[PDB]
Design a protein around this ligand. Structure first.
Ligand SMILES: *[C@@H]1O[C@H](CO)[C@H](O)[C@H](O)[C@H]1NC(C)=O
Ligand SMILES: C[C@@H]1O[C@@H](O)[C@@H](O)[C@H](O)[C@@H]1O
Ligand SMILES: C[C@@H]1O[C@@H](O)[C@@H](O)[C@H](O)[C@@H]1O
Lengths: 196, 201
């Protein structure tokens, strides 16, 4: 009865080409004869058809203008069920951070935690905010979160348990100009703190 | 004496004004302000850089660059030496001044008793500011009693002979404003075009 949906775009996922990914909010919707289409703010083309896979709808294309709003419609045959005007730059899901690394500096008695990001967060200069989460790998229930705009974070050795395994991971969300959603978590990094 | 308000300013962008390169132009609203040690800078919503400097071109401040993100708002600051005096957050897609129309043409069609008015615009070939509203203004050459206006989206208009004075000289010109997603300001007028209506029995 309700064909409401949500989408996320990703930018430069395969060279200069972007992607758009849409799915119904109701997981039980029969998608067998429902199609998705996007029209407007496209490069020299009126509309594009999504490809349907496993209840999800995908487009991979260079043809997003990224300036202005687009119209995304759920169609059965030619009949337009529901539509949504969306600026593709307001629903961006960043790629996950990666190559997480931890360095110990004995002199400073601290840990330098770095991670890698997109080509784009460097091209588009100040746009993402990152969320670094860590916790004692077992025993401890909830995570400790630190927000930052750069790719480098310091943890004081003496603010962590000694001789203990820590788990640490990172994710990103558009923070300036762009808007959107949390990336997937990076793969976790595990390390054991110095004994005392 | 001198007041902060003296340094209020306004800007306009032109998008793809030179191939893929854009422009941004800023000017103090007061034309008499001593600008001697004032510069302009823009920071934020740029590509690859944090900040760009404007060039000063005789009371006007100008930058040509491709490096506008065109997403979100930039900060445009009056600079005294290297310190910011006063700033404005501006979304560059909301202060677009189109390039002026050109190559106006008006031709009487004998069969139809009308005049076909055509003109041209570089915006036809742009990726971004592609949709404009045009304002065509025309008046008898002998008139500060003034102008008739027609608003249109296309580059071709018809004027009906029965609506014009016969055997008379008309002046006509055209300008444009952004009309879809982009917002901003009227362009300059095309040069004025002059045509005479036929005599009538
Ligand atoms: C950086 O990368 C992620 C992929 O890792 C997203 O593509 C995101 O859009 C990028 N951030 C910026 C600033 O564009
Ligand atoms: C896709 C990226 O390419 C580059 C490498 O430095 C990264 O590790 C990653 O493989
Ligand atoms: C401004 C325009 O540029 C292009 C040329 O084809 C036209 O003749 C005109 O000069």
């Amino acid at each position: 009865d309700d064909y409401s949906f949500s989408c996320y775009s990703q930018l430069e996922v395969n060279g200069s080409q972007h992607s758009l990914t849409c799915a119904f909010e109701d997981p039980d919707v029969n998608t067998t004869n429902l199609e998705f289409e996007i029209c407007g703010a496209l490069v020299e083309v009126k509309c594009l058809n999504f490809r349907k896979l496993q209840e999800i709808y995908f487009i991979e294309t260079k043809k997003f203008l990224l300036i202005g709003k687009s119209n995304i419609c759920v169609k059965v045959g030619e009949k337009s069920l529901t539509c949504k005007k969306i600026d593709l730059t307001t629903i961006v899901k960043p790629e996950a951070p990666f190559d997480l690394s931890v360095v110990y500096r004995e002199g400073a008695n601290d840990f330098v935690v770095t991670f890698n990001t997109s080509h784009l967060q460097k091209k588009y200069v100040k746009v993402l905010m990152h969320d670094v989460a860590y916790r004692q790998e077992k025993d401890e229930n909830k995570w400790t979160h630190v927000n930052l705009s750069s790719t480098k974070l310091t943890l004081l050795q003496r603010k962590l348990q000694p001789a203990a395994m820590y788990e640490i991971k990172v994710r990103s969300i558009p923070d300036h100009y762009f808007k959107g959603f949390w990336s997937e978590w990076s793969p976790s990094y595990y390390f054991r703190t110095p004994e005392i």
